[PDB]
Design a binder for these strands. Structure first.
Ligand SMILES: [Ca+2]
Ligand SMILES: [Ca+2]
Ligand SMILES: [Zn+2]
Ligand SMILES: [Zn+2]
Length: 295
RNA sequence: UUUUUUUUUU
C-alpha cells in the first residue's frame, strides 16, 4: 500500500553527487527509472526577482533505487552535469515528478538549456482535484498536501538563513543543509503513490500530465518568463483548469462553490462534531487534540 | 480553545 511504501521512502539516505565518477553512477541508476521525483535548490536572491537564483543542487529520487541523489551542480558545473542528464530529462518515457514545476523548469531551461518531457506536477494534481470537487484553484504548500493526501506531518538554521545571503553557495554544505535539500523529493515520490494510478482519485493522470506539459511549455522558453501563467503565484489558472480538467465542482447539497457535501455547514445545520474529540466547531483534520502541533 | 482553518517555488 501507499502507506507502508511511505515508511520505506522516508528512510532513503541522501548521497551527494559532486564528482564525475559519482555522476556517472547516478545517471546509470536514474536511467532505469520509470518515475523520478525532482527538486532544485538555488541561491537565494531578492524578493522582487521571481526567477530562481543560481542553481546549487538538483535533487532526484526514483523508483530505481532507495536513495536521494543530491547533484552538486555548483561543484560539477552545469556543463558537466547536463552532459548525460539532459537525455534523461528529455525522455518522455520516464515520468519526472515535481511539486510546483514552474520556477524549476524556468531554471532548467535558462540556466541548463534543458526542457524536461514527461512531467507531472503533483501540486497541480492536488489543485485539479480541488477544482473538480469544489472549483478551488489554490496551490497548496507541500506540508498541507502531505497531510491531506498521506496523513503525514513532516531544518531550522537553514530556514533561519533562508526566509530571513545566497544560503546554498557554501561548500561543503553542512549535513543538515543536505538533509533539508533531500526532504522534498522523498515526499514527492511517496505522494505519487497516493495520487498516480489510484483508481479512486477523481482526476485522470493523463489530464494532469497534459496540464503540466502546458506549464512546461510556458516556463521552459530559454529566457526568464515575462508574463506569468497564473494570475497570482499561489493559484492555478482557471482557464487552464477548465480546458484540461473540465468544469469545476461544487457542493451537491447547497450548490455553493468552495466545499463539498461532506463539509457543508448547511447540511450539518449546527449538528456536526469533530470525529476525534467530539466537540462542535472544528473538524478532525484541524483538531488540536488529535494534532497538538496545530496549537 | 478552531473554518470551509494552508509555506506557490527558492
Ligand atoms: Ca521545490
Ligand atoms: Ca526543496
Ligand atoms: Zn454546501
Ligand atoms: Zn477535535
Amino acid at each position: 500500500s501507499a502507506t507502508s511504501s511511505s515508511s520505506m521512502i522516508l528512510k532513503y539516505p541522501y548521497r551527494v553527487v559532486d564528482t564525475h565518477e559519482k555522476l556517472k553512477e547516478a545517471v546509470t541508476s536514474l536511467q532505469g527509472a520509470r518515475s523520478i521525483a525532482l527538486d532544485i535548490e538555488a541561491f537565494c536572491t531578492t524578493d522582487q526577482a521571481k526567477q530562481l537564483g543560481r542553481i546549487s543542487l538538483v535533487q532526484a529520487c526514483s523508483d530505481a533505487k532507495p536513495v536521494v541523489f543530491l547533484f552538486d551542480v555548483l561543484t560539477l558545473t552545469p556543463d558537466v552535469f547536463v552532459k548525460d542528464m539532459q537525455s534523461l530529462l528529455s525522455d518522455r518515457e520516464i515520468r519526472k515528478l515535481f511539486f510546483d514545476c514552474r520556477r524549476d523548469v524556468e531554471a532548467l531551461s535558462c540556466q541548463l538549456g534543458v526542457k524536461p518531457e514527461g512531467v507531472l506536477d503533483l501540486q497541480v494534481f492536488f489543485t485539479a482535484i480541488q477544482w473538480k470537487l469544489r472549483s478551488v484553484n489554490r496551490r497548496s504548500g507541500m506540508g498541507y498536501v502531505l497531510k491531506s493526501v498521506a496523513g503525514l506531518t513532516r531544518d531550522s538554521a537553514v530556514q533561519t538563513a533562508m526566509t530571513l545571503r545566497p544560503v546554498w553557495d557554501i561548500r561543503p554544505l553542512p549535513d543538515h543543509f543536505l538533509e533539508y535539500a533531500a526532504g522534498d523529493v522523498r515526499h514527492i515520490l511517496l505522494l505519487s503513490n497516493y495520487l498516480v494510478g489510484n483508481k479512486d482519485v477523481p482526476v485522470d493522470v493523463v489530464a494532469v500530465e497534459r496540464l503540466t506539459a502546458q506549464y512546461v511549455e510556458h516556463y521552459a522558453v530559454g529566457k526568464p518568463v515575462i508574463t506569468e501563467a497564473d494570475a497570482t503565484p499561489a493559484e492555478v489558472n482557471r482557464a487552464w483548469l477548465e480546458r484540461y480538467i473540465g468544469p469545476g465542482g461544487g457542493c451537491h447539497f447547497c450548490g455553493a462553490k468552495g466545499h463539498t457535501e461532506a463539509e457543508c455547514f448547511k447540511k450539518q445545520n449546527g449538528k456536526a462534531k469533530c470525529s476525534f474529540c467530539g466537540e462542535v466547531g472544528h473538524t478532525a483534520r484541524n483538531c488540536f487534540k488529535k494534532h497538538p502541533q496545530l496549537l
